[PDB]
A = this chain, B = another copy of it.
């Protein structure tokens, strides 16, 4: 229903500007904007596992939680997440909690892995933090699939300011490819 990965009044100037740039890329460069719904339910067709919200949309009040949008490039198997952490995501006063960046990375890795190769289960997440993120500022997260091997997708991420004069963190993630199962009709 509601796509939360669309602008609202809380988005900072830099986030809006970069969003517009990526929108243009969806017109002439093969990029696609991912929707972001209130949960994953009914949004992963055929998923078999062993009131509710997806974690990165746990806060629905604009500006206070995770504000973000992910763009995906299918041919290149890369994505970019524009992430603006709000004041309910704080660690030390005035800055985003490291765990909020970890969460946003895991979510971006997850969506990217799923679209690139039907990965979903996070096998590993390794993050090296470089600088604190000021609350309400734009974090640009560049994610790429480095390889797909042994039923696993390997990805890397760099999170930085728009002007790239501040790097916030670098990370790697490994995701398991979902198993395809051929069942008889019920």
Interface residues, chain A, CB within 8 Å of chain B? Answer: 39-41, 44, 47, 49-56, 58-59, 64-65, 87-100, 102-107, 110, 120-129, 132, 135
Contact = CB atoms under 8 A, between A and B. Distances in A.
A183 B135 CA distance: 27
A119 B103 CA distance: 21
Contact of A98 (B50, B91, B122, B135): B122
Contacts of A124: 126-129
Contact of A54 (B52, B90, B125): B90
A102 B106 contact: yes
Given A52-B93, A91-B110, A99-B104, 15 more contacts: A41-B93, A44-B92, A47-B93, A49-B92, A49-B94, A50-B132, A52-B88, A55-B97, A55-B99, A98-B110, A99-B106, A99-B107, A123-B129, A124-B127, A125-B125
